[PDB]
């Protein structure tokens, strides 16, 4: 493997928190990034008591990430696959997941880091970054299936990136992934047709993107508060959607509404979102984005 890292190069420092299939650690990795003798990293592991399905999914997720190179997607740095346990080493996102980050910015949050909530400009920047990462994933012919603030990560410089590919599926041959039946599923983020027909497409990721905008503007309130999981399933299939957060900027409300068109064919594409926002972004954006890259063809 070009991805293999010697185990002795990794040192675990502390627990970051439970991942999909086991604990994630903050660690040091020696000689993993050219130009750095030692780099602080995130290291994902599988739980000792993980089911066979979970063990398979953990390895599949690492494999998927090997194919990705995008500034707005969290980078896989290496795998320790010699001996045991398997360590999956990724780019450390200094400000954690976006759901946790947004919740910390609430005026009354105990962990308010002493910084103001996102400005409109900052919310637009976040939106464009998330949409750019998603545009990349779509161009690579994957559907994410779990787009949500908790699965976006925030870097040292506050750049947002797509993380957590635990539900991501290849759609190269057909442009959709179908899985009917019972599951432990992110019901509050799922599109009506996913709920009804078990179908997942870039359009259903777009529905979730709308919910991410709602999270950003509500500082990650719980969607459909007061509704149970089963009530949400009914409500959304029947044409229900979320109300606008208090003081939600109108530019963002307009976008959410478009993401929540009942007919998936009427929703925007991720490329359309970046394009809508392209003139309201940091000067570095065209230097790093998938949208502005030669790859976007």
């Amino acid at each position: 493997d070009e991805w293999e890292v010697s185990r002795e190069k990794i040192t675990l420092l502390r627990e970051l928190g439970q991942g999909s299939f086991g604990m994630v650690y903050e660690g040091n990795a020696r000689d993993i990034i050219k130009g750095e003798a030692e780099t602080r990293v995130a290291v994902k592991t599988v739980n000792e008591s993980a089911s066979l399905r979970e063990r398979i999914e953990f390895l599949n997720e690492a494999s998927v990430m090997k194919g990705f190179t995008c500034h707005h997607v969290v980078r896989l740095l290496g795998v320790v696959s010699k001996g045991q346990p398997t360590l999956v080493v990724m780019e450390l996102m200094a400000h954690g997941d976006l759901k946790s980050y947004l919740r910390s910015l609430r005026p009354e949050a105990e962990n308010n880091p002493g910084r103001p909530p996102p400005t409109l400009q900052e919310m637009i920047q976040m939106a464009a970054e998330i949409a750019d990462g998603m545009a990349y994933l779509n161009a690579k012919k994957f559907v994410h299936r779990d787009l949500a603030a908790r699965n976006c990560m925030v870097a040292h410089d506050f750049t947002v990136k797509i993380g957590d590919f635990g539900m991501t599926r290849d759609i190269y041959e057909t442009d959709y992934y179908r899985k009917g039946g019972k599951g432990l599923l992110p019901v509050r983020w799922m599109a009506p047709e996913s709920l009804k027909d078990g179908v997942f497409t870039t359009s259903s990721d777009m529905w979730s993107f709308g919910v991410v905008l709602w999270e950003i503007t509500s500082l990650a309130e719980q969607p459909y508060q007061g509704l149970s999981n089963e009530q949400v399933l009914k409500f959304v299939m029947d044409g229900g959607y979320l109300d606008q957060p208090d003081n939600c900027p109108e530019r963002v409300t307009d976008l959410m509404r478009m993401c929540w068109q009942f007919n998936p064919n009427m929703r925007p594409t991720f490329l359309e979102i970046v394009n809508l926002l392209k003139d309201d972004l940091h000067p570095s954006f065209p230097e790093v984005s998938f949208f502005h890259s030669e790859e976007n063809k």
């Binding site: 439970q18 991942g19 179908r178 039946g181 019972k182 599923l185 019901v187």
Partner: peptide, 14 residues
């Protein structure tokens, strides 16, 4: 890297 287990529910789709 917080888990939000409550963000998932056992439901049937399809």
């Amino acid at each position: 890297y917080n888990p939000y287990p409550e963000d998932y529910g056992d439901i049937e789709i399809g």
